[PDB]
Amino acid sequence: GCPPCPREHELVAVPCEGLNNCWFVEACPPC
Structure with missing residues (x-):
């Protein structure tokens, strides 16, 4: 899914x- 921390609200999708x-x-x- 999304990358490991840190991550704020990345629009991967x-x-x-x-x-x-x-x-x-x-x-x-x-x-």
């Missing part, structure tokens, strides 16, 4: 019109 319901991992939180 492109948000569908702002929404996060179309990712491999739905919005990785800070670390």
Whole structure:
């Protein structure tokens, strides 16, 4: 999914019109 810490809110997956319901991992939180 997303990289190991640290990580803030990197857009590894492109948000569908702002929404996060179309990712491999739905919005990785800070670390």
